[PDB]
Amino acid sequence: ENFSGGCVAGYMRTPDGRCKPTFYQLIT
């Protein structure tokens, strides 16, 4: 909702409220 990125730089947010790294988002 809050478009600050998601979590960390390179970290998106999951529907759990936790963070996921977008590294495998670019490779997969």
**Three-state SS string across 1-28, please?**
CCCCCCCCCCEEECCCCCEEECHHHHHC
Kindly list the distances between the CA atom of residue 12 and the CA atoms of 17, 24, 27, in Å, as whole numbers in the listed order: 10, 11, 15
Method used to determine the 3D structure: NMR
Q: Report the distance separating Cα 15 and Cα 3, nearest Å.
A: 14
